[PDB]
Structure 1
Amino acid sequence: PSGEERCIACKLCEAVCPAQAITIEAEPRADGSRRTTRYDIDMTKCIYCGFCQEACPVDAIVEGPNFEFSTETHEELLYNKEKLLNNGDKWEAEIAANIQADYLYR
């Protein structure tokens, strides 16, 4: 809620990825916090298993409600940390409500 990114560069979500679709690099940021310099999910190697949503400890990475994100080029589907954060900002209102709905089942 502060606006700080939830990711703490655990890379365990990268580790559990069945298709190795997540590439993560991290360095201590100017504040000294453990943040990701690089977070990439290849939406073309992803199997949309739902892992790393269960695996990620801080709830940072979430498969949101959107399904209509078709692209006219292959490169558009190789997401970047900026693109993923923009998606999180775009869909946070729905994502938070869905997590609230299902957080007790998890």
Structure 2
Amino acid sequence: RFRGEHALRRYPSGEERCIACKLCEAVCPAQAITIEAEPRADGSRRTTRYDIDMTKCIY
């Protein structure tokens, strides 16, 4: 359960898991996450910006 450095994960096929719902951005108590998104070239819902300020994060 230890909480360390952040990472973004993939499905077994290699496709990203993140779908730009921005729930993490909404809930973050330090406002450390910044997200931008748009439809990908194949129509998928994906991010174009996913930034975490680690000097703002309270982990």
TM value normalised by structure 1: 0.45
Instruction: Calculate percent identity across the aligned residue pairs.
Output: 100
- Which of 16, 25, 40 is the matching residue for 2:27? 16
Q: Which blocks of at least 5 consecutive residues in structure 1 are unaligned?
A: 49-106
Which structure would you say has the larger RCO, counting Cα contacts within 8 Å and 6 or more residues apart?
A: 2
4+ runs deviating over 2 angstroms: none
**Higher strand share goes to which structure?**
2
How many residues are treated as equivalent by the alignment?
48
**Higher helix share goes to which structure?**
1
Q: Larger C-alpha radius of gyration, 1 or 2? A: 1
Q: Which blocks of at least 5 consecutive residues in structure 2 are unaligned?
A: 1-11
In structure 2, distance between residues paired with 1:30 and 1:16: 29
CA RMSD of aligned residues (A): 0.4
